[PDB]
Amino acid sequence: QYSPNTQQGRTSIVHLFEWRWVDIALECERYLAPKGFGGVQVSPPNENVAIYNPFRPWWERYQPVSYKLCTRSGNEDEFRNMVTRCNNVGVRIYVDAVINHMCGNAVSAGTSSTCGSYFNPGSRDFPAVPYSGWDFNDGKCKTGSGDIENYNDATQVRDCRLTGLLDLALEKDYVRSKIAEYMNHLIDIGVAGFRLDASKHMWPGDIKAILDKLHNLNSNWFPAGSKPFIYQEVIDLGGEPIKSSDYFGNGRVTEFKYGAKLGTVIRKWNGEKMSYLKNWGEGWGFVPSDRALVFVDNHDNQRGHGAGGASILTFWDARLYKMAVGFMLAHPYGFTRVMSSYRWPRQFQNGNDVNDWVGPPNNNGVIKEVTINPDTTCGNDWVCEHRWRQIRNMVIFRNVVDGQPFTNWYDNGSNQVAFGRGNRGFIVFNNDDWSFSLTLQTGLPAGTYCDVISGDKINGNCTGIKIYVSDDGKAHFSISNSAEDPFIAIHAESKL
Numbered sequence: 001q002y003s004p005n006t007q008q009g010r011t012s013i014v015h016l017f018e019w020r021w022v023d024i025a026l027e028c029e030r031y032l033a034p035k036g037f038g039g040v041q042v043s044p045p046n047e048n049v050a051i052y053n054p055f056r057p058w059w060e061r062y063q064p065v066s067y068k069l070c071t072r073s074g075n076e077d078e079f080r081n082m083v084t085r086c087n088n089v090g091v092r093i094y095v096d097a098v099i100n101h102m103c104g105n106a107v108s109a110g111t112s113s114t115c116g117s118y119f120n121p122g123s124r125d126f127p128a129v130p131y132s133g134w135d136f137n138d139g140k141c142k143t144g145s146g147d148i149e150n151y152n153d154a155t156q157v158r159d160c161r162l163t164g165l166l167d168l169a170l171e172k173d174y175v176r177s178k179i180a181e182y183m184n185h186l187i188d189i190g191v192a193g194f195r196l197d198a199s200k201h202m203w204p205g206d207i208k209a210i211l212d213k214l215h216n217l218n219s220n221w222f223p224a225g226s227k228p229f230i231y232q233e234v235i236d237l238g239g240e241p242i243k244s245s246d247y248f249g250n251g252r253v254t255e256f257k258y259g260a261k262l263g264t265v266i267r268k269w270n271g272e273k274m275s276y277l278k279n280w281g282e283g284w285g286f287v288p289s290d291r292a293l294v295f296v297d298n299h300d301n302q303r304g305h306g307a308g309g310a311s312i313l314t315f316w317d318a319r320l321y322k323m324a325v326g327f328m329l330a331h332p333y334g335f336t337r338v339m340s341s342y343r344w345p346r347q348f349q350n351g352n353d354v355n356d357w358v359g360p361p362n363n364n365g366v367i368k369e370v371t372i373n374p375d376t377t378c379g380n381d382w383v384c385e386h387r388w389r390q391i392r393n394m395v396i397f398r399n400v401v402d403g404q405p406f407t408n409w410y411d412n413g414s415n416q417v418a419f420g421r422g423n424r425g426f427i428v429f430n431n432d433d434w435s436f437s438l439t440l441q442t443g444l445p446a447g448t449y450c451d452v453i454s455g456d457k458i459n460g461n462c463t464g465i466k467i468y469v470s471d472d473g474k475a476h477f478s479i480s481n482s483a484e485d486p487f488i489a490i491h492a493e494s495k496l
């Protein structure tokens with residue numbers, strides 16, 4: 001469950017948050033395959049509540065109605081078409097599996113659902129699954145409200161309703177089997193793995209029992225006996241009884257400390273400084289690298305109220321965000337996920353964004369196509385961070401340097417740092433309020449290298465900065481604090 005099942009030499013996943021299946025299929029073919037991306041995390045592909053107050057929020061997709069593959073992203077045939085097309089170009093699909101819960105207990109009964117299935121939260125009736133009252137934790141939860149009230153009680157965190165979401169009775173073989181039926185439908189379609197949503201709200205052993213029911217990956221595309229990649233969304237920032245290590249026997253875990261701390265460092269909050277990153281990884285209290293799914297931001301915490309709060313860097317913070325993403329993609333810790341977002345009219349009142357619910361770009365609730373501009377950016381309010389030169393080129397950097405050790409660290413005791421990845425890549429950052437001009441040991445073979453942040457290697461030339469590595473492995477780097485991107489990255493495949 002720990003291996004991503006990407007092609008060898010492809011080392012990241014991208015979250016194409018709220019994208020439609022047909023757009024992901026096209027993106028696999030036209031961009032993700034040629035640019036070296038390992039795979040795509042898709043939004044939940046199962047039927048959810050259609051919520052109209054407020055209007056079609058992103059978070060309606062975390063309120064299941066059934067396991068029909070029928071959502072605003074598309075129907076089952078469209079989902080299968082995407083998985084097939086992506087697998088056929090060697091780009092994997094990972095499903096966001098919403099399996100802890102059904103919808104909010106106070107949602108009105110009816111057919112306000114993305115496939116029109118009937119459901120009745122108040123009577124616990126989800127006939128399109130089917131689930132009934134026997135399949136929820138009403139009787140097991142011991143809190144006075146029926147909801148999670150106190151995260152210091154690890155039992156109620158698992159047995160009670162997360163902000164009122166009806167909590168499935170995951171100890172029951174019937175329920176485990178309905179979840180496995182859904183997940184095996186997806187595996188047999190060709191998905192390579194899963195994000196397990198709300199994993200802190202499930203017992204490790206119930207997750208294990210579900211995983212024990214799962215198939216190996218579809219043998220038309222994957223070697224025999226390949227296990228689905230599992231990454232469990234466990235928010236563990238310390239200071240609560242639940243530890244993400246309890247989940248290591250099932251798969252990887254999301255390491256939310258990663259982006260929280262990287263954000264604080266890059267923002268220079270509380271005296272933190274990039275020079276402190278020399279021992280980034282387990283030295284910062286993180287999970288073992290081989291159990292980590294890492295990211296700068298995710299779809300929930302990029303809205304400011306998630307794990308990490310205001311420290312999280314996002315596309316709105318583009319300059320610092322590119323630096324953070326670049327550090328992540330250069331550093332060997334973890335398996336990396338890049339975010340790809342949509343723009344919304346963020347409107348802070350009293351320090352909080354009142355429009356943080358807004359769903360994906362849409363016309364009357366129908367999600368807009370992703371259009372591609374001549375300059376390779378996206379239209380229709382899709383941000384497409386994964387197409388930013390500085391991010392895409394660092395996705396490639398990570399591939400190029402795969403397996404190479406962290407080495408040749410330098411820092412100035414403040415926020416000018418650099419390091420290499422064996423003899424295959426080198427990266428230099430200036431997050432101080434002055435220039436960084438110094439000759440550094442790069443570990444690379446002598447030659448001329450294109451900086452892949454300011455430019456590209458195209459037609460045997462560099463379009464941006466060029467770095468000259470001498471026979472001693474040293475090269476001079478100059479980065480003004482006024483530079484568009486105050487970091488430089490070079491690697492074996494950017495050498496002229």
Ligand SMILES: *[C@@H]1O[C@H](CO)[C@@H](O)[C@H](O)[C@H]1NC(C)=O
Nearest residue numbers: 457458459460461462463496
């Ligand atoms: C690189 O750029 C120079 C200057 O524009 C040009 O003469 C040359 O043809 C380009 N390509 C190579 C491979 O040198």
Ligand SMILES: [Ca+2]
Nearest residue numbers: 158159167201
């Ligand atoms: Ca639960």
Ligand SMILES: [Cl-]
Nearest residue numbers: 195233254298
């Ligand atoms: Cl996540």
